[PDB]
């Protein structure tokens, strides 16, 4: 049975009895930087099991009127164990990441989520005449959510779902590494993202390599007396984490 | 010329033009824990260059009436870059350390220090009827100093030099890995300490593996108009740092 699967990274292990295979980035699997592609001359540090493990973020509640959510990495993991510590003390970073979104219900509930990883998910502002604030793009492990209607915020992100806050069609986000969580068949979604960037390495605070978006295309629904609380938890584990440029920790 | 020497660990490098060879612990050189001597089953983390580098502690001033100083490791390095971060997040630790005490003067100054590394330097209390407080044993990179006379503190350490705060003779401390800093010939002292303990690994906050003591046997002296400020700086770099038992950081 390919339904059941097990994931093991570091001192963490995830279990599943209702998965749907595993999407591996753009056909590639996380790998350390090679010598014929490196730029930083200093010998990198590789904490390995210390940083490459499963980090669970704050759960989110899926409601009949939920429009979606989104996280930005590696920023969202700035306060996660040693992975966040290396981000502070190092100028350059490089990691893989294994996204694992969980969400279970019952054979009597219905709904369908879209777990996607969007590289360089540059987003727009609510007020097209102004700019956006980092605080409105990503706020730690705290998820930002999409709205079923237009936003008005000064420096807020245009959370209107239909445009995914990028000025595009949500139905075309399938062009990015993704999976769906169709409650009647699924229970979770896993995506192994390889380091994608136009540079061997990059800062992890200044640059948001990719954005994880969970947009429901099939509204959550159910009958009376059926558990109304359906949470959606996101777990991610860095892979082949390398760091360069060691210096005094950065004051957030 | 064996006078000049260079040390390179991580992104740090020390230079010397007036050293006196290098003492290597008890004939042994730092090495990672072997499989036939390990106990912790989990795969350890080895930050390498991230934690194994030269960490300089607060300098100290050598005065004509100075009685001595002492530091306790790895405790003293609890707030040093990533080496301190791994101490917080891990239950077990293991490291080598390369002690390098600097202290220069001139051909017109005189004095002689005793740089020693005392394993399990269990110390006594000022008031033999009471106990000592961790706060009085080691206080971060801040050095505790020996006194030329008896102490009286409630839970203070018997800082009287002649007994080195251990109830022994200071003249016999030469039985521990050491070197002297005879200003007329020296300029610094280096000691490579191998992991010494009755256990493969151990906690780094609860246990003070060894104590570094700098006791002057030849009082600092000089003539008029001769620089009166003679500082003594201590630099130490972990070696073969291994960590086990990853969990939530420990609140100091």
């Amino acid at each position: 049975s390919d339904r059941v699967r097990s994931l093991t990274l570091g001192n963490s292990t995830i279990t599943t009895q209702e998965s749907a295979n595993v999407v591996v980035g753009y056909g590639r699997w996380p790998e350390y930087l090679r010598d014929d592609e490196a730029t930083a001359e200093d010998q990198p540090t590789q904490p390995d099991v210390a940083t490459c493990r499963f980090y669970t973020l704050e759960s989110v509640q899926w409601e009949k009127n939920s429009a979606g959510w989104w996280w930005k990495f590696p920023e969202a993991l700035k306060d996660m164990g040693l992975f966040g510590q290396n981000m502070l003390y190092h100028y350059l970073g490089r990691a893989g990441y294994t996204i694992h979104v969980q969400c279970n219900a019952s054979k009597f509930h219905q709904g369908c989520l879209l777990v996607v990883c969007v590289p360089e998910a540059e987003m727009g502002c609510s007020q097209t005449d102004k700019e956006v604030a980092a605080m409105n793009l990503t706020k730690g492990e705290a998820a930002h959510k999409f709205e079923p209607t237009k936003t008005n915020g000064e420096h807020t992100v245009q959370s209107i779902v239909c445009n995914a806050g990028m000025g595009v069609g949500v139905g075309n986000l399938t062009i990015y590494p993704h999976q769906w969580i169709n409650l009647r068949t699924n229970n979770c979604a896993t995506i192994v993202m390889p380091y994608v960037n136009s540079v061997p390495m990059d800062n992890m605070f200044r640059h948001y390599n990719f954005t994880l978006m969970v947009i429901p295309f099939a509204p959550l629904d159910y009958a009376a007396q059926a558990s109304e609380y359906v949470p959606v938890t996101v777990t991610i584990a860095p892979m082949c984490a390398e760091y360069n440029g060691l210096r005094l920790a950065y004051q957030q | 010329s064996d006078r000049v020497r260079s040390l390179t660990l991580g992104n740090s490098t020390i230079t010397t033009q007036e050293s006196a060879n290098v003492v290597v612990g008890y004939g042994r050189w730092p090495e990672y824990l072997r499989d036939d001597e390990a106990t912790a089953e989990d795969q350890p983390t080895q930050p390498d260059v991230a934690t194994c580098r030269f960490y300089t502690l607060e300098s100290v001033q050598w005065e004509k009436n100075s009685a001595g100083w002492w530091w306790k490791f790895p405790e003293a390095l609890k707030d040093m870059g990533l080496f301190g971060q791994n101490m917080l997040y891990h239950y077990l630790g293991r490291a080598g350390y390369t002690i390098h005490v600097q202290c220069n003067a001139s051909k017109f100054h005189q004095g002689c220090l005793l740089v020693v590394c005392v394993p399990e330097a269990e110390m006594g209390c000022s008031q033999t009827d009471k106990e000592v407080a961790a706060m009085n044993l080691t206080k971060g990179e801040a050095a505790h100093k020996f006194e030329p006379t008896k102490t009286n503190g409630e839970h203070t350490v018997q800082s009287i030099v002649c007994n080195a705060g251990m109830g022994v003779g200071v003249g016999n401390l030469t039985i521990y890995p050491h070197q002297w800093i005879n200003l007329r010939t020296n300029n610094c002292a280096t000691i490579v300490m191998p992991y010494v303990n009755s256990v493969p690994m151990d906690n780094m906050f609860r246990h003070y593996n060894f104590t570094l003591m700098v006791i002057p046997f030849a009082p600092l002296d000089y003539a008029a108009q001769a620089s009166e400020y003679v500082p003594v700086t201590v630099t130490i770099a972990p070696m073969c740092a291994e960590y086990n038992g990853l969990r939530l950081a420990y609140q100091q």
């Binding site: - | 064996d2 060879n21 612990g25 010939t185």
Partner: protein, 61 residues
């Protein structure tokens, strides 16, 4: 038996000086002390230097 003959320590009539031994107990902790292990290596404490120092030469140069 599993007898093991060893050499005795010099007597006051030197310059058949051997004894026999057999362990009767199953635990090695029951055996007698090892008063005849003469190993040495002062180097650890007397010469723990990284660079070999030749006696007939200057310590520093």
């Amino acid at each position: 038996m599993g007898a093991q003959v060893s050499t005795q320590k010099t007597g006051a009539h030197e310059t058949i000086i051997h004894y026999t031994n057999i362990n009767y107990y199953k635990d090695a902790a029951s055996n007698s002390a090892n008063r005849q292990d003469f190993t040495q290596d002062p180097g650890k404490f007397t010469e723990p230097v990284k660079d070999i120092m030749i006696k007939t030469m200057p310590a520093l140069n």
